[PDB]
Ligand binder design. Sequence first.
Ligand code: NA
Ligand SMILES: [Rh+]
Ligand SMILES: [Rh+]
Ligand SMILES: [Rh+]
Length: 129
Amino acid sequence: KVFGRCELAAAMKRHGLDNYRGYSLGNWVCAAKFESNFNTQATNRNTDGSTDYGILQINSRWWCNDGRTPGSRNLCNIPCSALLSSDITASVNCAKKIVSDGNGMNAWVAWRNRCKGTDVQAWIRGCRL
Ligand code: NA
Ligand SMILES: [Rh+]
Ligand SMILES: [Rh+]
Ligand SMILES: [Rh+]
């Protein structure tokens, strides 16, 4: 599923991401935009042989099991395929764990390089939240 911007903003808010660990909803929408282009089915192989999954590009080296990432963890206790579903529940639950892990939203490289310090409130412009 390729979410709309305000559609994703509304789902993210419903699932309790707006201000989670102090990160405003615009930060989360901005991260999703530059991680996945709002596509729940996005996958990207990493140089270490892990893969990033879903609208928030969650990594198989730590967070989910894809069966092909040796000596990896599964700290969200889910198959990586669960993070590709039209329903963002599993990606949101797992993202809450990631952002709580110590480095906050710096865990998302597209957030750090393209959203951090910018006018992220622009990402929820015009949305009836
Ligand atoms: Na894994
Ligand atoms: Rh929920
Ligand atoms: Rh819920
Ligand atoms: Rh960690």
